[PDB]
Every structure is written in structure tokens, then in C-alpha cells.
Design an enzyme around this catalytic site. Structure first.
Site, PDB file in Angstrom:
ATOM      1  N   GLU A 138      24.060  -8.189 -10.230  1.00  0.00           N
ATOM      2  CA  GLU A 138      23.118  -8.841  -9.315  1.00  0.00           C
ATOM      3  C   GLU A 138      22.729  -7.907  -8.166  1.00  0.00           C
ATOM      4  O   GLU A 138      22.837  -8.255  -6.982  1.00  0.00           O
ATOM      5  CB  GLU A 138      23.679 -10.184  -8.810  1.00  0.00           C
ATOM      6  CG  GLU A 138      23.732 -11.257  -9.893  1.00  0.00           C
ATOM      7  CD  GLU A 138      23.998 -12.658  -9.384  1.00  0.00           C
ATOM      8  OE1 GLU A 138      24.570 -12.821  -8.281  1.00  0.00           O
ATOM      9  OE2 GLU A 138      23.639 -13.609 -10.119  1.00  0.00           O
ATOM     10  N   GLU A 156      23.115 -14.540 -17.000  1.00  0.00           N
ATOM     11  CA  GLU A 156      23.955 -15.662 -16.594  1.00  0.00           C
ATOM     12  C   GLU A 156      23.071 -16.872 -16.433  1.00  0.00           C
ATOM     13  O   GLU A 156      22.279 -16.952 -15.485  1.00  0.00           O
ATOM     14  CB  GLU A 156      24.689 -15.402 -15.277  1.00  0.00           C
ATOM     15  CG  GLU A 156      25.515 -14.131 -15.229  1.00  0.00           C
ATOM     16  CD  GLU A 156      26.039 -13.832 -13.830  1.00  0.00           C
ATOM     17  OE1 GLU A 156      26.048 -14.745 -12.968  1.00  0.00           O
ATOM     18  OE2 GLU A 156      26.437 -12.674 -13.584  1.00  0.00           O
TER      19      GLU A 156
END
Ligand SMILES: *[C@@H]1O[C@H](CO)[C@@H](O[C@@H]2O[C@H](CO)[C@@H](O[C@@H]3O[C@H](CO[C@H]4O[C@H](CO)[C@@H](O)[C@H](O[C@H]5O[C@H](CO)[C@@H](O)[C@H](O)[C@@H]5O)[C@@H]4O)[C@@H](O)[C@H](O[C@H]4O[C@H](CO)[C@@H](O)[C@H](O)[C@@H]4O[C@H]4O[C@H](CO)[C@@H](O)[C@H](O)[C@@H]4O[C@H]4O[C@H](CO)[C@@H](O)[C@H](O)[C@@H]4O)[C@@H]3O)[C@H](O)[C@H]2NC(C)=O)[C@H](O)[C@H]1NC(C)=O
Ligand SMILES: *[C@@H]1O[C@H](CO)[C@@H](O[C@@H]2O[C@H](CO)[C@@H](O[C@@H]3O[C@H](CO[C@H]4O[C@H](CO)[C@@H](O)[C@H](O[C@H]5O[C@H](CO)[C@@H](O)[C@H](O)[C@@H]5O)[C@@H]4O)[C@@H](O)[C@H](O[C@H]4O[C@H](CO)[C@@H](O)[C@H](O)[C@@H]4O[C@H]4O[C@H](CO)[C@@H](O)[C@H](O)[C@@H]4O[C@H]4O[C@H](CO)[C@@H](O)[C@H](O)[C@@H]4O)[C@@H]3O)[C@H](O)[C@H]2NC(C)=O)[C@H](O)[C@H]1NC(C)=O
Ligand SMILES: *[C@@H]1O[C@H](CO)[C@@H](O[C@@H]2O[C@H](CO)[C@@H](O[C@@H]3O[C@H](CO)[C@@H](O)[C@H](O[C@H]4O[C@H](CO)[C@@H](O)[C@H](O)[C@@H]4O[C@H]4O[C@H](CO)[C@@H](O)[C@H](O)[C@@H]4O[C@H]4O[C@H](CO)[C@@H](O)[C@H](O)[C@@H]4O)[C@@H]3O)[C@H](O)[C@H]2NC(C)=O)[C@H](O)[C@H]1NC(C)=O
Ligand SMILES: *[C@@H]1O[C@H](CO)[C@@H](O[C@@H]2O[C@H](CO)[C@@H](O)[C@H](O)[C@H]2NC(C)=O)[C@H](O)[C@H]1NC(C)=O
Ligand SMILES: *[C@@H]1O[C@H](CO)[C@@H](O)[C@H](O)[C@H]1NC(C)=O
Ligand SMILES: *[C@@H]1O[C@H](CO)[C@@H](O)[C@H](O)[C@H]1NC(C)=O
Ligand SMILES: *[C@@H]1O[C@H](CO)[C@@H](O)[C@H](O)[C@H]1NC(C)=O
Ligand SMILES: *[C@@H]1O[C@H](CO)[C@@H](O)[C@H](O)[C@H]1NC(C)=O
Ligand SMILES: *[C@@H]1O[C@H](CO)[C@@H](O)[C@H](O)[C@H]1NC(C)=O
Ligand SMILES: *[C@@H]1O[C@H](CO)[C@@H](O)[C@H](O)[C@H]1NC(C)=O
Ligand SMILES: [Cl-]
Length: 968
Positions: free
Chosen positions: A160, A258
Site C-alpha cells: 500500500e 486485498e
């Protein structure tokens, strides 16, 4: 270019030149450190129809001492990879270095608090700090790539990499290129995939330096309000994801690395049972089918199995459990309805290649369905078939909606149902309707009922369809054959023949119907019956299923059973199933090979009958054995005081002095004369103790102190043996300012202030540049009224040896700084012969910390998977106390009486010895002048499962040995 095993185009990955839809579940090996149970999870994932697992590696657990990489024993990745291979599961490797993961430091070891450089930046001090870790972990990953015959197909660098601040020129292409080059330099040739927290286009192909091979992003669209599990807020369903994909990375397959599979729960939260209700079967069918509306080709669910934050590995906001409300529970059971629902979609994707080659269109409120109350997103193919994802336009609607469809087919456009009646969408449900769907050369012109699976067998084809209760459905097949009902009633089955088709209408029933059209048999099921169907791959060379390749997918069989079907194989005249049972189970096998004459279940010869349609039937009886669990309150509990520090005889002369005039922490400048930050001295985990020596003037009045342990921490303070008070803790407080009144002191006498601080774990580091993982633990400020700061000289301790941590088997985070932990008394067979006999149910009558030891034997039966739990009572509002429980040396419970929510603590077989002796070590810290005690302490079990699992080997459980480095 680097390799040809894993390639891609704009639609999908290819594995060895064949398209595959990657359907993956997140599973962290460090959260279930028992290799036989890792295989269990992989087999349960394969049984969903999934073909992949995604995993983090936690740097903090494998380089606790800087320069000493240790990923051995319970931390060994190689048995994890071999379990994936055995189960037929590919892997997405996500080694970080930064992982977030609701883990301590977000994966960063506490010694990064001494790095003079911005974390997750191109600063040399940070990059240098990561080199040893990556060169090791990426080498291990490289060894197990698909290119070398292993399971690993994709690699994620970083995590991320999406948000920057505080002077960082984000995104830094030099930084991400360095991170990517570390992996490549270690031998990783498979494609690199990122996981942008939002669809922000970071590091997408075409961005130049630092670009990954496949752009991925994350999505947790329903959020985390587990306390209101029925509330689906407006605007939470994504609609623009394909639009963004075509703008941001049109040349690569659409990938969500995700996608929400559950939720985290903090200290004091509603509990993971509530999280499982929020992200339940309804969430899955609406939100996951919505992802199919975007033609998602790589989809990973975070988490599929969460496991446990044992041994202080978790971040400070979270507690011991990481159940996550996922499809497989923390205790490994697959009873949640969301598991069975997910299996239906996984098995659809496994057998529907036309899904990947279709042309997705924009969502519509007209043209396909006859009402604007429904939204339909088309995926249109010519010869290869079309798909129509139907949901309520208001995605939260619980209304029942009647409708008809207008669908394009190769035979022309058609209004469905043709034979009368209407279709129904009942509330929070979504359907994938199909047209021109290929069943091995037989064309299903359309089906309104959803496809679970289909196979071509030697004696004919089988298609399995399902609907929800109350629904009417219709299908049409390209054929000149008529339809015959071959099982069940003809009631409510309607049909018509045309020149080139047969059309069949049906109402969903709890009783199965089977219809026959030429050499195709079609099962017509309700959803709840479909939940009990399984599609194991049928191995003909050996016993392992293999990966989900076209040939091995095609060779599968259809099994109706109960709790679980793991595997199937053919050997000589025998058909062998491996399966688990939690109740007496009727087993049916559809597609039995012509050469099979005998049935085996878990290796045992099992009688069967054959019906007129060739289906094999058998019965597996369930009779649970007596499970005898010892009464924990009746054990021979031995006690020792584990706060000897507050006795006047205590000698701390061997403790490290907290005498560093400068901090190595770049985040927070010192506000005390020396550093009292625990990580400056190598102490990153568990309880921290500080001892402040001064000589009294006799005019002292108060002592103020700012302690910091992270969210929900507590602290207690004594002056010699005199209890001053405690901060009992709140989730809202990561630090606390206390002013304590002192007793009258004697001029010229020496006193020692003892401070105990719960370290809840180190902070994550989500925003690059903010350096929040550097947030210190320990004492930030103090003031002894009327005296200079320098009047107090401090010593401190955390886990014995700090970064030279004692327990190389159980890892660097497991034990903290308490006397009993420092001595190693938490391990099997402590030196407790002469200790006082006292129980944690008796507890303490003043503020302090007690240590309690007892053993118990288990003699549970072989061939049963029996989930065991430790239970700490909280029937009435308690006094404030904190508990840790070590099971055979492994910390598997951290408990805060006044904050919660966890009272039930699963402990896996392997940590527990089911046919042997077990050791409990319990610490009880009473943050109250009147002391404290446990209300109850019990072992319990949930439904025993008759299991195919092999024997679980106990993990290494080093016994107590005297430690020469202890302070005694
Ligand atoms: C699959 O895996 C799952 C995750 O690992 C696993 O779920 C976990 O299961 C354990 C064991 O059941 C749970 O711990 C228990 O939780 C009980 C409270 O939860 C129930 O009640 C809630 C409020 O009504 C419900 O909301 C809740 O429903 C929700 O959650 C369900 C899953 O748990 C789910 O199915 C539902 O759909 C829904 O979402 C749920 O029904 C809690 O009561 C219990 O403590 C008692 O039992 C312990 C032993 O197991 C004792 O040690 C303890 O002391 C308690 O016993 C006392 O109280 C009982 C009830 O009052 C009495 O029956 C006992 O006799 C005993 O009574 C004494 O003490 C009383 C004081 O309390 C006193 O009044 C009496 O006089 C007497 O002296 C335990 O904590 C855990 O929460 C689950 N975890 C998660 C994440 O869900 C699941 O079980 C696995 N399934 C299978 C099949 O393996
Ligand atoms: C052996 O292994 C087996 C697995 O192989 C295992 O079997 C599984 O067991 C679980 C339970 O542990 C089953 O899940 C539950 O199923 C309940 C029964 O309903 C199902 O079956 C019905 C037919 O028999 C269907 O009609 C029904 O469909 C309807 O309901 C669906 C779910 O809501 C809905 O999506 C459908 O569209 C349709 O409307 C369903 O398929 C089911 O009731 C239960 O749901 C509750 O619990 C879930 C959490 O566990 C929540 O996600 C869900 O929202 C429900 O919550 C309600 O109940 C909770 C207490 O349990 C409360 O905490 C909640 O607040 C909430 O209660 C409120 O709302 C209620 C309305 O629902 C209301 O009545 C209340 O008053 C309150 O206001 C759950 O899904 C699973 O289906 C089984 N699987 C299989 C394959 O059989 C078996 O248990 C194992 N055996 C042993 C001994 O261990
Ligand atoms: C044994 O039994 C006893 C007796 O039943 C149990 O004691 C109870 O324990 C409860 C849970 O800890 C406790 O409730 C808490 O009370 C505090 C107030 O002191 C409150 O802050 C808590 O609610 C917040 O935090 C929880 C998570 O801990 C969240 O789930 C909840 O949504 C609330 O979140 C808000 O505050 C957080 C912290 O600041 C934020 O992170 C979060 O974003 C959110 O912030 C918003 O709201 C704030 C205001 O609330 C606002 O400031 C902010 O700007 C945001 O807008 C929680 O309700 C009971 O008090 C306690 N009862 C008694 C009688 O003592 C005990 O736990 C049991 N033990 C076990 C082991 O089970
Ligand atoms: C408070 O505790 C300290 C030690 O923790 C006590 O220190 C002792 O002081 C005596 C003199 O009175 C010395 O002979 C001992 O060597 C000291 N022991 C240690 C271990 O340092 C101190 O006396 C206590 N204060 C009071 C007022 O009783
Ligand atoms: C589909 O949606 C996109 C994004 O809003 C829009 O640019 C385009 O015009 C739409 N295409 C069609 C064929 O309506
Ligand atoms: C249908 O599947 C068969 C074999 O299973 C294959 O030969 C054929 O090309 C497929 N047809 C279409 C239209 O994709
Ligand atoms: C086709 O089957 C149905 C019963 O399923 C029957 O009504 C009809 O007569 C059959 N057609 C022919 C041509 O035999
Ligand atoms: C980091 O390095 C700079 C430049 O050498 C120095 O001024 C500073 O004191 C260092 N900071 C810490 C916290 O070590
Ligand atoms: C002793 O404490 C009292 C109360 O704070 C104060 O009035 C006095 O100045 C103190 N004595 C000395 C010598 O500092
Ligand atoms: C404690 O005091 C310090 C110094 O004034 C302050 O920065 C900090 O925010 C305070 N802590 C709390 C929890 O209020
Ligand atoms: Cl010691």
C-alpha cells in the site's frame, strides 16, 4: 521476458499458456505456526474452488536481532510452501519489508526506531536496514517460484505504497525501483504486483522507473462498523472500478490484491463474532459478484483465515484474536454460512473460461431486466458466452423484486421466462445469469439459475444449478432431444421443444430434481442443498490433487457430503475420498469412474449402493468420543511473586542503566535528561519495567509521570514497597499523565520508584514520511516536585537480553520483562518444587504481579479434530487486572479485565499436546490496591470433527533452563 510460466494480457494471467481466474485467500504463516494445520487451511481453501493463497512475512519475527535472519522451525516458510504444493494452491508472496497487517511495527522490528532516516524512503539508513532481510526472504521465495517447480506465481514488493507526507516527494520512483531490484537481485523472476490502497495509479505500467508488472489495488468498501452488522451505508458498493482500471492500467488484468473478507476489531470492540455478521454470506454474494461485474481476473480476500496474534506479534490497537470474521474461523472451523456461499462462487469461476474472454459493458437499469429497481452489468461474448450480474439498484435493499430478462443469445434475443411466471431477486442477493454457456460442447442457451459446477464424465455430462428458496427459474439447451425427469417429482417442471432447443422451467425445492436432456444430466438444487456439494480434483497418479490446471479441473468429480471434502483419487478398482464430518452424513458421488468398484473414505472400506442413474451412495456415521478435559481450577497451582523489585532487598545492579544522553529516535526529541525510550536499549515487546533511584531531601510531595504503551496500555507505580497508583487503561489512551502523592520520606535515605508499563506493540507506519512506527514506548516525562530531573537515575528492562533475545525457538516477541519471564519460568517444567501452593483463582490481596504454574495431561482420541479454548470469566464487572497465559511456553492469551472483549482463547493442537503433558503459566497483574483474582479459568471444546487430517506433531517446546544472563 524474464520467464514464460506466468504471463498476462489485458484480460487475465496465463499459467503455462492457459488462462486462469486467480481466486485467492489471505493466510499468514506466522499466525498459525503448526505445519500440519497450515495444510488443513490450504485444503479448506482448495475446497472453496480457490487456486491461490496470498501471504505476508513478518520481518519483526525473523530478524529480531539486527544482522541475524532466523526463519527456522515454527517460522520456516519451506513447509508452508510444500503444504501449498500438496494442496494444489498457488501463492502470492508478500514479504514487505513493510506489511502493515495489524502487526507490531507493521512488520518493522523495533530496532528501526534507531534508524537515522525516513522509513519507507530512499534514505540510505532505511534502505541499508532492509537489505539483509530482503536478501534472505526473497531468496527463499525465489527458490519456490513456479519457474523452479514450486507454487509461487506472483510477488508483491512493499505494501500500500499510496500515502506520503512530511517532506517526502511521494511517490518516489527511486525508492520503489530499489525495492523491486532487491527482489530481482535475489532471483525473483515472476511478475511483480502492487496493492495501491486506493485506485490511485501508483507504480502502474507506463509510469517509468519504479513501475510494477501488474497494477493492483485494495478495497474494503463495507468498512469496519462491526457493532452495526446489518447496516449497509449508502454509496459503499463500488461501481467505477473497471472505468478506473481502463484509465490506470489497461494493459494488465484487473486485480484487487486485498478485497475485504472480514474486519479487524480493536481492544474494547464488539468482538469478531459481530465482524463475521457484518461480512457474512449476504455481503459476499452481493459484493463479490459485484467484483465479477468488473471482470476481475485476480481477486484475493483479506483474510480467508486470520489465526492468532500469539506472542505479542500484533499491533497495539488489536488484541490476541485475529479471527477477522473470515470464512475459516480462528479455530479453523468452516461452519460459517459465508464459507459455503463463497464455495458456490469459487466453483463457478473454476469452470467458466468464457468469463475471462467476455467484453464487459457498463451497468444498466434497463434493457436487460424489465425494472429500474434492478441493476444488470453485462459481460458479452459471441461464441464464448455471456454473463449478467444482477443486483438491486439500491444495493442495501431487502425487498423482494419480481422481474423478467431480455438477453442476447446466439439463437437470438429472448424474453425470459418464455414458459410463464417471473424471476425473483430476494433482498441482499445477486445472481450471475448465463447465456451460451459451454458444457463440453453442449450449449446452454441460457440459465437463470446459477451454475455451481459442470463436468464431462465417460458416461455423460453433468451440470449443477441452484436457486434460492421461492424462486422460479428457466433454462434452454441447444438440442433436438426432449427433457425427462429422472429423479424427483415432475410437479412444477414445465417444458417446451422448439426446432433446435428444449426449454425447461422449474421451481426451487428443498428436494433435488435431476433432469436428463440427451447425454446431459442437470441437478436442480436449492442454495442450502448446494452448500453440501464439493468438487474435489480426482488424482489418477498419486493422491495429491495438483494445481487447478485445465486438465486437472476437467478430471474432477462431484461429491454431496457434509462438513468437508478434501480430496479424491482413483487407485486400481478403488475410489478414495478424504473428508471431515461433524454429523452423520449421507455421501453421494456423481461421476464415479467406470473402473471403480469399491469406495474408501479416509482409507476405510465403505459400503455403497448404486441407484438407477449411476450415483453412488454411502453413509458415514458420526459418534463423538468422550472428550475428557481437566478442571483447571483443581490443578496443583504453584505461585511465585513476579514483582520482587518492590521488596527492599531487591538488587538491580545488573540491570541496564537508562543513561543515554542522546536518543537515536528521530521522531521524538527527548524531554527527560536521558532516554527512557525502551527501543533505544533494544526492548521492543511485552511488559517493561523502569527503576528510578534518588536520595530524598525529606520535603518531597508528588511524583508526576507520562507513561506510553500504546492504545489500551496500563501502568503501575511504587515507591519502594508503597503502592502509589495505576493507570488502568483505556482504548482511547496510548499515553497517560499521572501525578502521584508520595508518603513522607526520610531526608538522606535512598528510594527507588518502580514503574511497570504494558507495551501493547509498536505502531504501524501507514503514511510514508510520518515515521509513526518510531512512536516510543516507556517514560516520556517525569517530575519529582521540588527536585531537578537529574535527581533520579533510571534503570530499565524488557525481555532479557533485548535484541540478544533468549528464546530462539519461540521468537523475539513472545516474552516480556517480568522477573518470571526473564528467568524463563513460563516454559515447561519450571523450578517450582519449593514454591507456595496458590491459584490465580485465589489471586492477590494487594497491587502487584503474581506468576502461577501448573501442568495437566490430555488423552484425546486420534482421528478427531477437537478445537480447545481457554476461558477467563467475566460474568460481573471486574476489578482492573491484566493476564498473560503461556501454553507450553507460547503466549496465547493477553487479557485486560476492564477493557476486553476477549474471554475465549483458542489454542491449536501442536501448541497443545493432545496425548501428553501440558504446561500453563499465568501472570496476574492487579492494578488496584485491593489486589485481584480470576473469577474462573476453564478449558472447553467445540464440536469434535471426525477428520482426515494426519497426526499433528507437537512443535518444539523448550523446557525451563537456568539463564546465566538473568539479573539475580
Ligand atoms: C467455530 O470457530 C469460532 C471461532 O473460533 C467459535 O466461536 C467461538 O466459540 C466460543 C465457544 O462458544 C465463544 O465463546 C463463548 O461465547 C459465549 C457468548 O456468545 C454467545 O452469546 C452471545 C450473547 O447472547 C451471542 O451473541 C453469541 O452469538 C454470536 O456468536 C456465535 C459464535 O460464538 C454465532 O454462532 C452466532 O450466530 C452469533 O454471531 C453466542 O451465542 C459465552 O457465553 C461463553 O462463555 C461461557 O462458556 C464457557 C465455556 O465455553 C465458560 O468457560 C464460561 O464461563 C461461560 O459459561 C457460563 O455461561 C454459559 C452461558 O450463560 C453457561 O451455559 C455455562 O454453564 C456457564 O454458566 C456459569 O457461569 C455463568 C456466568 O457466565 C453463571 O450465570 C452460571 O450460574 C454458571 O455458574 C464463551 O465465552 C466465542 O465467543 C466464539 N468466538 C467467535 C469469534 O465467535 C465457534 O464456537 C466454532 N464452532 C464450532 C462448531 O467449532
Ligand atoms: C456442522 O457443520 C455445518 C457446516 O458444514 C454447520 O452448519 C452450518 O451452521 C451454521 C450455524 O452455525 C449455519 O448458519 C446459520 O444458518 C441459520 C439458519 O438459516 C439458514 O438455513 C435456512 C434453511 O434451513 C435458510 O432459510 C436461511 O436462509 C435465510 O437466512 C440467510 C442468513 O440470514 C439469508 O442470507 C437468506 O437469504 C435467507 O433469508 C439460512 O441459509 C441462520 O439463521 C444463521 O444466520 C444468523 O447468524 C449469522 C451469524 O452466525 C448471521 O450472519 C445472520 O445474519 C443471522 O444472524 C441472526 O442470528 C444471530 C444468532 O445466531 C444473531 O446474532 C443476529 O443478530 C441475527 O439475529 C437477528 O435476526 C434474526 C433473523 O435472521 C432474528 O430471527 C433474530 O431474532 C434477531 O433479531 C446462520 O447463517 C449454516 O447455514 C450451516 N451450514 C450448512 C452447510 O449446513 C453445523 O452447524 C455444524 N454442526 C455442529 C454441531 O457444529
Ligand atoms: C468484562 O465486563 C465489563 C463490564 O461489562 C466490561 O467493561 C466494559 O468494557 C467496555 C469495552 O471496553 C467499555 O466500553 C467502552 O467505554 C469507553 C468509554 O470509557 C468508550 O470509549 C468505548 O467505545 C469506543 O471504543 C470502542 C473500542 O474500544 C469502539 O468499539 C467504540 O465504537 C468507541 O469508539 C470510539 O472511541 C475510540 C477511542 O477514542 C476511537 O478509536 C473510535 O474511532 C471511536 O471514536 C469516535 O467516538 C468517540 C467518542 O466515543 C470520539 O471521541 C471520537 O472523536 C470519535 O468520533 C467503549 O464503549 C465499558 O465502559 C466497560 N463497562 C464497565 C461497566 O466498566 C469489560 O470490557 C469486560 N471484559 C472482557 C475481557 O470482556
Ligand atoms: C528503599 O529501597 C532501597 C533498595 O531498593 C533501600 O536501599 C538500601 O539502603 C540501605 C541503607 O538504609 C543499604 O544498606 C542497602 O544496601 C540498600 N539496599 C539496596 C538493595 O540498594 C532503601 O533503604 C529503601 N528505603 C527506605 C527508606 O527504607
Ligand atoms: C460507459 O461508461 C463510461 C464511464 O462513465 C463512459 O465514458 C462511456 O460513455 C460508457 N459507454 C457506453 C457505451 O455507454
Ligand atoms: C466448448 O468446449 C469444447 C471442449 O470442451 C471446445 O472444443 C469448444 O471449443 C468450446 N466451444 C466454445 C464456443 O468455446
Ligand atoms: C417430451 O417430454 C414431455 C414430458 O417431459 C412430453 O409431454 C412430450 O410428449 C415429449 N415429446 C415427445 C415428442 O415425445
Ligand atoms: C541523525 O543524523 C543527523 C546528521 O548526522 C544528526 O544531526 C542527528 O543528531 C541524528 N539524529 C538522531 C536522532 O540520531
Ligand atoms: C518544602 O516544601 C514546602 C511546600 O512546597 C515549601 O514551602 C518549601 O520551600 C520547601 N523547602 C525548601 C527548602 O525548598
Ligand atoms: C501528557 O502531557 C504531555 C505534555 O504536556 C502532552 O504532550 C500529552 O498529550 C499528555 N498526554 C495526554 C494523554 O493527555
Ligand atoms: Cl532476573
Amino acid at each position: 521476458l524474464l520467464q514464460k510460466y506466468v504471463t498476462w494480457d489485458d484480460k487475465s494471467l496465463f499459467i503455462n499458456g492457459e488462462r486462469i481466474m486467480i481466486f485467492s485467500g489471505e493466510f499468514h504463516p506466522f499466525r498459525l505456526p503448526v505445519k500440519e494445520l497450515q495444510l488443513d487451511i490450504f485444503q479448506k481453501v482448495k475446497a472453496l474452488g480457490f487456486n491461490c493463497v496470498s501471504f505476508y512475512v513478518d520481518w519483526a519475527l525473523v530478524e529480531g536481532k539486527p544482522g541475524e535472519y532466523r526463519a527456522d522451525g515454527i517460522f520456516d516458510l519451506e513447509p508452508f510452501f510444500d503444504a501449498a504444493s500438496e494442496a494444489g494452491i498457488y501463492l502470492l508472496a508478500r514479504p514487505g519489508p513493510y506489511i502493515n497487517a495489524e502487526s507490531s511495527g507493521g512488520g518493522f522490528p523495533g530496532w528501526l526506531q534507531r534508524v537515522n532516516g525516513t522509513l519507507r524512503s530512499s534514505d540510505k539508513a532505511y534502505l541499508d536496514a532492509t537489505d539483509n532481510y530482503v536478501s534472505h526472504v526473497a531468496a527463499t521465495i525465489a527458490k519456490y517460484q513456479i519457474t523452479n517447480g514450486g507454487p509461487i506465481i506472483l510477488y508483491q514488493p512493499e505494501n500500500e505504497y499510496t500515502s506520503g507526507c512530511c517532506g517526502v516527494e511521494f511517490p518516489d520512483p527511486v525508492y520503489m525501483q530499489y525495492v523491486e531490484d532487491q527482489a530481482r537481485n535475489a532471483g525473483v523472476v515472476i511478475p511483480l504486483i502492487n496493492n495501491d490502497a486506493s485506485a490511485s495509479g501508483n507504480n502502474a505500467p507506463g509510469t517509468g522507473k519504479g513501475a510494477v508488472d501488474i497494477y493492483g489495488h485494495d478495497s474494503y468498501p463495507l468498512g469496519f462498523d462491526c457493532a452495526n452488522p446489518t447496516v449497509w451505508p449508502s454509496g459503499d458498493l463500488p461501481t467505477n472500478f473497471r472505468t478506473l482500471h481502463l484509465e490506470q492500467s489497461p494493459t494488465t488484468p484487473y486485480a484487487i490484491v486485498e478485497f475485504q473478507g472480514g474486519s479487524y476489531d480493536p481492544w474494547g470492540g464488539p468482538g469478531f463474532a459481530a465482524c463475521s455478521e457484518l461480512l457474512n454470506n449476504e455481503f459476499e454474494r452481493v459484493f463479490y459478484k459485484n467484483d465479477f461485474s468488473f471482470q476481475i481476473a485476480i481477486m484475493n480476500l483479506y483474510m480467508i483465515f486470520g489465526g492468532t496474534n500469539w506472542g505479542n506479534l500484533g499491533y497495539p490497537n488489536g488484541y490476541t484474536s485475529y479471527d477477522y470474521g473470515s470464512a475459516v474461523t480462528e479455530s479453523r472451523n468452516i461452519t460459517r454460512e459465508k464459507y459455503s456461499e463463497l464455495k458456490l462462487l469459487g466453483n463457478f469461476a473454476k469452470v467458466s473460461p468464457g468469463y475471462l474472454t467476455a467484453s464487459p459493458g457498463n451497468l444498466t437499469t434497463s434493457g436487460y431486466a424489465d425494472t429500474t429497481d434492478l441493476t444488470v452489468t453485462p459481460l458479452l461474448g459471441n461464441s464464448t458466452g455471456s454473463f449478467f450480474v444482477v443486483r438491486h439498484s439500491d444495493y442495501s435493499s431487502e425487498e423482494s423484486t419480481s422481474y423478467k430478462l431480455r438477453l442476447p443469445t446466439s439463437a437470438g434475443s429472448v424474453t425470459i421466462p418464455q414458459l410463464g411466471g417471473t424471476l425473483t431477486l430476494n433482498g441482499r442477493d445477486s445472481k450471475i445469469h448465463v447465456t451460451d454457456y459451454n458444457v463440453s460442447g453442449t450449449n446452454i442457451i441460457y440459465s437463470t439459475a446459477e451454475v455451481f459446477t459442470w463436468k464431462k464424465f465417460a458416461d455423460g455430462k453433468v451440470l449443477v444449478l441452484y436457486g434460492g428458496a421461492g424462486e422460479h427459474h428457466e433454462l434452454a439447451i441447444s438440442t433436438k432431444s426432449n427433457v425427462t425427469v429422472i429423479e424427483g417429482s415432475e410437479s412444477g417442471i414445465s417444458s417446451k421443444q422448439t426446432s433446435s432447443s428444449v426449454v425447461v422451467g422449474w421451481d426451487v425445492s428443498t428436494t433435488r430434481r435431476i433432469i436428463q436432456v440427451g447425454d446431459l444430466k442437470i441437478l436442480l438444487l436449492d442454495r442450502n442443498s448446494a452448500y453440501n456439494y464439493w468438487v474435489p480434483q480426482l488424482a489418477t497418479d498419486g493422491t495429491s490433487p495438483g494445481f487447478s490446471t485445465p486438465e486437472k479441473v476437467a478430471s474432477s468429480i462431484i461429491v454431496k457430503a457434509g462438513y468437508l471434502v478434501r480430496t479424491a483419487y482413483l487407485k486400481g478398482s478403488g475410489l478414495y475420498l478424504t473428508a471431515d464430518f461433524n454429523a452423520t452424513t449421507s455421501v453421494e458421488v456423481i461421476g464415479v469412474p467406470s473402473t471403480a468398484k469399491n469406495l474408501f473414505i479416509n482409507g476405510d472400506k465403505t459400503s455403497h449402493t448404486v441407484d438407477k442413474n449411476g450415483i453412488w451412495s454411502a453413509t458415514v456415521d458420526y459418534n463423538a468420543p468422550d472428550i475428557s478435559l481437566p478442571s483447571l481450577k483443581d490443578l496443583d497451582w504453584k505461585y511465585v511473586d513476579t514483582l520482587p523489585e518492590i521488596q527492599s532487598s531487591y538488587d538491580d545492579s545488573l540491570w541496564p542503566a537508562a543513561d543515554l544522553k542522546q536518543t537515536k529516535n528521530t521522531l521524538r526529541s527527548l524531554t527527560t535528561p536521558t532516554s527512557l525510550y525502551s527501543s533505544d536499549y533494544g526492548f521492543h515487546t511485552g511488559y517493561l519495567l523502569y527503576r528510578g533511584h534518588f536520595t530524598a531531601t525529606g520535603n518531597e510531595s508528588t511524583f508526576a509521570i507520562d507513561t506510553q504503551g500504546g492504545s489500551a496500555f496500563g501502568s503501575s507505580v511504587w515507591l519502594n514497597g508503597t503502592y502509589l497508583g495505576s493507570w488502568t487503561g483505556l482504548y482511547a489512551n496510548s499515553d497517560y499523565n499521572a501525578t502521584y502523592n508520595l508518603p513522607q520520606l526520610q531526608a538522606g535515605k535512598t528510594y527507588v520508584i518502580t514503574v511497570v508499563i504494558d507495551n501493547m506493540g509498536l505502531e504501524e507506519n501507514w503514511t510514508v514520511g510520518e515515521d509513526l512506527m518510531k512512536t516510543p514506548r516507556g517514560i516520556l516525562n517525569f517530575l519529582l516536585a521540588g527536585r531537578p530531573s537529574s535527581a533520579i537515575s533510571w534503570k530499565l528492562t524488557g525481555n532479557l537480553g533485548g535484541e540478544d533475545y533468549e528464546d530462539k525457538v519461540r521468537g523475539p516477541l513472545n516474552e516480556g520483562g517480568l522477573y518470571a519471564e526473564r528467568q524463563g519460568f513460563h516454559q515447561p517444567e519450571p523450578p517450582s518444587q519449593n514454591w507456595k501452593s496458590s491459584s490465580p483463582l485465589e489471586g492477590l490481596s494487594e497491587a502487584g504481579i503474581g506468576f502461577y504454574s501448573a501442568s495437566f495431561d490430555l488423552d484425546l482420541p486420534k482421528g478427531w479434530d477437537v478445537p480447545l479454548f481457554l476461558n477467563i470469566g467475566n460474568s460481573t464487572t471486574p476489578s482492573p487486572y491484566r493476564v498473560q497465559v503461556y501454553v507450553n511456553g507460547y503466549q496465547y492469551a493477553k487479557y485486560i479485565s476492564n477493557i476486553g472483549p476477549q474471554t475465549s482463547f483458542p489454542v491449536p493442537e501442536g501448541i497443545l499436546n493432545y496425548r501428553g503433558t501440558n504446561w500453563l503459566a499465568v501472570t496476574l497483574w492487579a492494578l488496584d490496591s485491593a489486589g485481584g483474582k480470576l473469577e474462573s479459568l476453564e478449558l472447553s471444546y467445540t464440536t469434535p470433527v471426525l477428520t482426515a487430517l494426519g497426526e499433528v506433531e507437537s512443535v518444539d517446546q523448550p523446557k525451563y533452563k537456568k539463564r546465566k544472563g538473568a539479573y539475580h
